[PDB]
């Protein structure tokens, strides 16, 4: 009995964080092999951000205009280029602490850890999900840009996110490590709509299974449902439609608990239609959607 | 525009975690200098745990009964001893990655990060509070024993907790790094009562300030209260009494927001008496008490290590 949101240990990523300064702007970079990766908006003034021409701004920059510091070590920049919304600064030294790593573009509803940093130094670690609307519900102050999101599988770090923007609505957006934004967003200070923030249905179901495994079973009811019937209710409550692929992913949790996936769907349907009536599940007063099936299996 | 339960970066602690096996029991140890610290119950069989005489059990153990592994490197144990409920294994190698560190005994209501480990390998990190009844609401599976809790000030790691026990009620108990349990608990597999728990009032207030700083202000009222009047309501709802020390601790958050501490107390009073009526605060449907005032300042000011 005990179930918590957990981040990956951050040590492998801490060894890759550097500070990047261009003019008056300082933010975070990621140093892997002999390349430092950071948001291209490092080259922008506050004024430039309203309507930046990144190509023209970068052409006014030279290698020596990029100050890159890894702890107390100044790195020597020997080249620069822009890949989508990320700057790649070639340095003359490979990071001796480069872990085994991959760049991955994650799917909506998948989770990852963020190492929040300021001025190239780690502040803290927390677990997030890529929302279906391609925003992330985090904590990123001024100077946090270039902080990264990651998953670890044994010794391999899969980087999936680099932080770029806070939208006027207070939500956060960023890119993969090839510099492509998740979602429709751009690296400009303008009004930008995130779409409807749908709930990640398969993750809620995974967490209900986690609740059963940990002895919190009050919400189990005597009903079943069909995918199509359930989805009519999901749609009404701004939940993601459930597919057979999702049902299949939940199969191991179904097996462990003896509760068929559509039976759990019927329990969720009743919770949606009736509310939780002031009750808690795993100590939460609302339905949690930022644990994946894999996350639940790992912890359970 | 965002406020999250945030753990400290774990890198300095990761370099100190090892696996300790004694017979059929494997759990985690903390390797600092040439000492590995772990729960003394590593020396117990399942049977011994029901009523162990640790002095007698330790006497029957030899150095060669303790297998210690740091990654794939087996360390050689050259001595063993007991300090309260923690076993200290002397090894023939000093940990080259030993950080600047202290051992501290934290107060109820204070927070710390746990590096949950299994068989000596770090698995994840999360932020916890020491409950008023000296339990932890965490996630500690079989093999997680010997995982440690810590805070970081600048470059210094302050270890404050080592995990020992899952009580039959599913809550967790452990020790400081001198092996003294927090609370009434013992390292025996027996029924053990945890006290009545209470909600950490000063931490709820700090989190309400965090909400205001992040633009969530619906629960602010133009009502007042006194400390004594507020505490009459706190008592009814199993909240900790608020003291002037607590008011003083909240002063910087009061200053930042322009909201007097007793004014925020009046807001909390109304939330307790009336409920939240289906509304959320910082995305939560209940009042969060596992952020200290210092935690709120740290996260809102972007302190680094």
Swiss-Prot record, chain A:
Q: Where is this cross-link: Glycyl lysine isopeptide (Lys-Gly) (interchain with G-Cter in ubiquitin)?
A: 5, 90
Listed under catalytic activity are:
TSAVLQ-|-SGFRK-NH2 and SGVTFQ-|-GKFKK the two peptides corresponding to the two self-cleavage sites of the SARS 3C-like proteinase are the two most reactive peptide substrates. The enzyme exhibits a strong preference for substrates containing Gln at P1 position and Leu at P2 position
Q: Which residues are in the Peptidase C30 domain?
A: 1-300
Give, from the UniProt record, the effect of changing residue 90 to R: In strain: Beta/B.1.351
Q: What results from changing residue 49 to A?
A: Does not affect ability to cleave and inactivate human TRMT1
Topology feature Cytoplasmic, residues? 1-300
Q: Give the active-site positions.
A: 41, 145
Per UniProt, activity regulation is: Inhibited by pyridone-containing alpha-ketoamides compounds 13a and 13b. In turn, alpha-ketoamide 13b (tert-butyl (1-((S)-1-(((S)-4-(benzylamino)-3,4-dioxo-1-((S)-2-oxopyrrolidin-3-yl)butan-2-yl)amino)-3-cyclopropyl-1-oxopropan-2-yl)-2-oxo-1,2-dihydropyridin-3-yl)carbamate) inhibits SARS-CoV-2 replication in human lung cells. Inhibited ex vivo by michael acceptor inhibitor N3. Inhibited ex vivo by compound 11a and 11b.
Query: Which chain positions lie within coiled-coil regions?
Result: none
Compartments, as annotated in UniProt: Host cytoplasm; Host Golgi apparatus; Host nucleus
Quaternary structure per UniProt?
3CL-PRO exists as monomer and homodimer. Only the homodimer shows catalytic activity. Interacts with host FBXO22; this interaction promotes the proteasomal degradation of nsp5.
The entry's function note states: Cleaves the C-terminus of replicase polyprotein at 11 sites. Recognizes substrates containing the core sequence [ILMVF]-Q-|-[SGACN]. Cleaves and inactivates human TRMT1, preventing tRNA guanine(26)-dimethylation of tRNAs. May cleave human NLRP1 in lung epithelial cells, thereby activating the NLRP1 inflammasome pathway. May cleave human GSDMD, triggering alternative GSDME-mediated epithelial cell death upon activation of the NLRP1 inflammasome, which may enhance the release interleukins 1B, 6, 16 and 18. Also able to bind an ADP-ribose-1''-phosphate (ADRP).
According to UniProt, the name of this protein is 3C-like proteinase nsp5
Recorded source organism is: Severe acute respiratory syndrome coronavirus 2 (2019-nCoV)
Q: Which gene encodes it?
A: rep
Covered part of the full sequence, start to end and full length, is 3264 to 3563 of 7096
From Swiss-Prot, chain B:
* Residues in cross-link Glycyl lysine isopeptide (Lys-Gly) (interchain with G-Cter in ubiquitin): 5, 90
| Reactions performed catalytically | TSAVLQ-|-SGFRK-NH2 and SGVTFQ-|-GKFKK the two peptides corresponding to the two self-cleavage sites of the SARS 3C-like proteinase are the two most reactive peptide substrates. The enzyme exhibits a strong preference for substrates containing Gln at P1 position and Leu at P2 position
Q: Where is this chain's protein located in or outside the cell? A: Host cytoplasm; Host Golgi apparatus; Host nucleus
The annotated consequence of residue 142 to A reads: Does not affect ability to cleave and inactivate human TRMT1
Regulation of catalytic or functional activity: Inhibited by pyridone-containing alpha-ketoamides compounds 13a and 13b. In turn, alpha-ketoamide 13b (tert-butyl (1-((S)-1-(((S)-4-(benzylamino)-3,4-dioxo-1-((S)-2-oxopyrrolidin-3-yl)butan-2-yl)amino)-3-cyclopropyl-1-oxopropan-2-yl)-2-oxo-1,2-dihydropyridin-3-yl)carbamate) inhibits SARS-CoV-2 replication in human lung cells. Inhibited ex vivo by michael acceptor inhibitor N3. Inhibited ex vivo by compound 11a and 11b.
Active-site residues annotated for this sequence: 41 (for 3cl-pro activity), 145 (nucleophile)
Look up what happens after changing residue 145 to A.
Complete loss of 3C-like proteinase nsp5 cleavage
Which positions fall inside the Peptidase C30 domain? 1-305
Spans within the Cytoplasmic topological domain: 1-305
What role does it play? Cleaves the C-terminus of replicase polyprotein at 11 sites. Recognizes substrates containing the core sequence [ILMVF]-Q-|-[SGACN]. Cleaves and inactivates human TRMT1, preventing tRNA guanine(26)-dimethylation of tRNAs. May cleave human NLRP1 in lung epithelial cells, thereby activating the NLRP1 inflammasome pathway. May cleave human GSDMD, triggering alternative GSDME-mediated epithelial cell death upon activation of the NLRP1 inflammasome, which may enhance the release interleukins 1B, 6, 16 and 18. Also able to bind an ADP-ribose-1''-phosphate (ADRP).
Self-association and partners: 3CL-PRO exists as monomer and homodimer. Only the homodimer shows catalytic activity. Interacts with host FBXO22; this interaction promotes the proteasomal degradation of nsp5.
Q: What is this protein called?
A: 3C-like proteinase nsp5
Question: What organism does the record attribute this protein to?
Answer: Severe acute respiratory syndrome coronavirus 2
Q: Which gene encodes it?
A: rep
């Amino acid at each position: 009995s005990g179930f918590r949101k957990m981040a990956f240990p951050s040590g492998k990523v801490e060894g890759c964080m550097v500070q990047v300064t261009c003019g008056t702007t300082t933010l975070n970079g990621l140093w892997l092999d002999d390349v430092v990766y950071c948001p291209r908006h490092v080259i922008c003034t506050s004024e430039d951000m309203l309507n930046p021409n990144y190509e023209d701004l970068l052409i006014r920059k030279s290698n020596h205009n990029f100050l890159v510091q890894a702890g107390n070590v100044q790195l020597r920049v020997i080249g620069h280029s822009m890949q989508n919304c990320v700057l790649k600064l070639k340095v003359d030294t490979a990071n001796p602490k480069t872990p085994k790593y991959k760049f991955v573009r994650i799917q909506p509803g998948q989770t990852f850890s963020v190492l929040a940093c300021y001025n190239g130094s780690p502040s803290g670690v927390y677990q997030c999900a890529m929302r279906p609307n391609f925003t992330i519900k985090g904590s990123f102050l001024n100077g946090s840009c270039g902080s990264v999101g990651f998953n670890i599988d044994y010794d391999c770090v899969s980087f999936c996110y680099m932080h770029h923007m806070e939208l006027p609505t207070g939500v956060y957006a960023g890119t993969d490590l090839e510099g492509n934004f998740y979602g429709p967003f751009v690296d400009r200070q303008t009004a930008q709509a995130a779409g409807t923030d749908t709930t990640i249905t398969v993750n809620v179901l995974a967490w209900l299974y986690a609740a059963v495994i940990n002895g919190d079973r009050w919400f189990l009811n005597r009903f079943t449902t069909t995918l199509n019937d359930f989805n009519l209710v999901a749609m009404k409550y701004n939940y993601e439609p459930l597919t057979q692929d999702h049902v299949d992913i939940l199969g191991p949790l179904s097996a462990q608990t003896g509760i068929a996936v559509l039976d759990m769907c019927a329990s969720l349907k009743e919770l949606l239609q009736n509310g939780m009536n002031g009750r808690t599940i795993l100590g939460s007063a609302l339905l949690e959607d930022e644990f994946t099936p894999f996350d639940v299996v790992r912890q359970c």
